[PDB]
Amino acid sequence: VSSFERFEIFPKESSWPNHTTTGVSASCSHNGESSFYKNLLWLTGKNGLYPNLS
């Protein structure tokens, strides 16, 4: 690669107001404490709702 910059395309907040972004798994544990990928988000329902997103 000649040039390469990591940028936050969909910020954890502001981008998913009506979904839950906190999802983590024990299969991706950092320091024996469940975590998840640093470049992806697990979207889940907020308050019994997973509204259609675009």
Partner: protein, 114 residues
């Protein structure tokens, strides 16, 4: 302080129906499930179902599918459990519960009963 206050005792004859009430206070009534669990005399706990006040989505146990109807209101922060076609073995104590134990992992993503 979170609190669930249920309706008063009921005496019915077989075939009749009941509608038990569960009014919530101390939290936003729409954030968490309302579970329904019964306990017959001397025996253990038997889970009946849940209803999520915000969406209205329902999860009925298998034994109770069709015989039971769970509803809400949201305006008065109340959930309802209607039982139909009652029978002597339906004599029991009916508890409601709040699904406020938010899950820690998406492996076991279950709202436990606070």
């Amino acid at each position: 302080e979170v609190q669930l206050v249920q309706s008063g005792a009921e005496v019915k004859k077989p075939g009749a129906s009941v509608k038990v009430s569960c009014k919530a206070s101390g939290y936003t009534f729409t954030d968490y499930h309302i579970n329904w669990v019964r306990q017959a005399p001397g025996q253990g706990l038997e889970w009946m179902g849940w209803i999520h006040p915000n969406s209205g989505d329902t999860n009925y146990a298998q034994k109770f599918q069709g015989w039971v109807t769970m509803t809400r209101d949201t305006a008065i922060s109340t959930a309802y459990m209607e039982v139909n076609g009652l029978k002597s073995d339906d004599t029991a104590v009916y508890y409601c519960a709040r699904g406020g134990l938010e899950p820690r992992s998406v492996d076991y993503y279950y709202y436990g009963m606070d």
